[PDB]
């Protein structure tokens, strides 16, 4: 005794679309990270809930250590090194999905993390206290 | 006070909520069969607090406790005049007058958060 009245986007519907266009549905995933509840069985229920808590806190900590916490997408001051890819700025944004780019760069992750941490610490916070005094 | 503004009008208890806010900024501070229950209790507390902090953090309202946003209020949800609301109604009555349209309001805040604030910010960054 029901009808269907679809309005908004699907969960991971934009995954087959292009990156610069599929960047506008980022809300729905973080909307749907910590729900589903909305003897042995309750044991594995609590197991699953703990795992979800752990991954969400891990990624929020990685957000918080960077200077891109709380908000969504942002900027930085680390200039790009062309040793990783060498595209000419249209082939990525208009001609490439996300799984393709993920398989292209899945060896350089930790260096990028460390260098963002480096520029976030250095010349941003000691520099702040330099600016906090004449 | 701990839930001290109960039997008041919404417009009446509209100024001293900051003392409520500092007093509601606690709960973990100032610290077998039963231990299973204790574990489950801690799990419930953690899940509720993280639910609230997630729903704050998605919107632009995750700093201060009151804020403004860019959504025009549609007259399909309620139709009562402004002074009629702020001087003649409690919180619970307003709750039962709005507790069917809540998810749509959430989704509209979400789309207003994503659109025209970050990709627009990204175009504003390019000089």
């Amino acid at each position, epitope marked *: *005794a*029901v*009808g*269907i*009245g679809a*309005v908004f986007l699907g969960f991971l519907g934009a995954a087959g679309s292009t990156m610069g266009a599929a960047s506008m549905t980022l809300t729905v995933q973080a909307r*749907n990270l910590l729900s589903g509840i909305v003897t042995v069985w309750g044991i594995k229920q609590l197991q699953a809930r703990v795992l979800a808590v752990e991954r969400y806190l891990r990624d929020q900590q990685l957000l918080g250590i960077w200077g891109c916490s709380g908000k969504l997408i942002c900027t930085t001051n680390v200039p790009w090194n062309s040793s990783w890819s060498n595209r000419n700025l249209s082939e990525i944004w208009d001609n490439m999905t996300w799984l393709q780019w993920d398989k292209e760069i899945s060896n350089y992750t930790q260096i990028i993390y460390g260098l963002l941490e480096e520029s976030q610490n250095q010349q941003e916070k000691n520099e702040q206290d330099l600016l906090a005094l004449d | 006070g701990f839930l001290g503004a109960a039997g008041s009008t919404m417009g009446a208890a509209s100024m001293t909520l900051t003392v409520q806010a500092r007093n509601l900024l606690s709960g973990i501070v100032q610290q077998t069969v039963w231990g299973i229950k204790q574990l489950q209790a801690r799990v419930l507390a953690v899940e509720r607090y993280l639910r609230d902090q997630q729903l704050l953090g998605i919107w632009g309202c995750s700093g201060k406790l009151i804020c403004t946003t860019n959504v025009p209020w549609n007259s399909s949800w309620s139709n009562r005049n402004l002074s009629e609301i702020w001087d003649n109604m409690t919180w619970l009555q307003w709750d039962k007058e709005i507790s069917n349209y809540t998810q*749509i309001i959430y989704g509209l805040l979400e789309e207003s958060q994503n659109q025209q604030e970050k990709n627009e910010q990204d175009l504003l960054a390019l000089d």
Partner: antibody
Amino acid sequence: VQLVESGGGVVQPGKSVRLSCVVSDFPFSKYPMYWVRQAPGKGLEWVAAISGDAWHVVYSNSVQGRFLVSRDNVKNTLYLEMNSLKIEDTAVYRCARMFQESGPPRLDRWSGRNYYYYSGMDVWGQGTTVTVSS
Amino acid sequence: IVMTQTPLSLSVTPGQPASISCKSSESLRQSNGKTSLYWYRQKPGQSPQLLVFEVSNRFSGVSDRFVGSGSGTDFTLRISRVEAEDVGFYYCMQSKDFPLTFGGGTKVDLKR
């Protein structure tokens, strides 16, 4: 409560009409309405049903490609149309009301999809009959 | 989704209990937490009138002889104190899924 079923008549095949149904004594913007069908000397049959806010509509297995129904919330008046008729479509046509008051739609946070809810009826009016003849 | 009446029809006499079934073809346990089986009766040359909703819940302004019964396997009815006013056709009706379906027909009269 007041609820009439106007619109008797007799036609040959291949026509187009307009039907009316006057209501009173309820807040018309809240309720759903149905259309049932009773063949002569027979039992009952469901045809069509319009949504509460007049945006969703379902038909029977027969006339998907024939009919059209619409709601006037201002005049509190139902409008039905039956086109491309057949002589064996002669029955009793009645305009009756769901018992249970429905409410607002529901929006899931999982790929939106606004859902509606229906249930059966309580009140039948008198009725009418158009015999499609030759 | 189909639905059958059980049995067809019966002539009855006063001073007797009554029970009229309506066999399902599925189980219609709603996510709201109940089952969508309604009864409503008509009289000849007249309009139908609502008998019982909520499986087992008498309609407002109805004498106490009318209640409901049954679960998602199959259903029955429950009428005591047979009276001549209780004649006509009794229909069971599905209100779970589109399209709806109806009970066939129960002819009810006295005995000669």
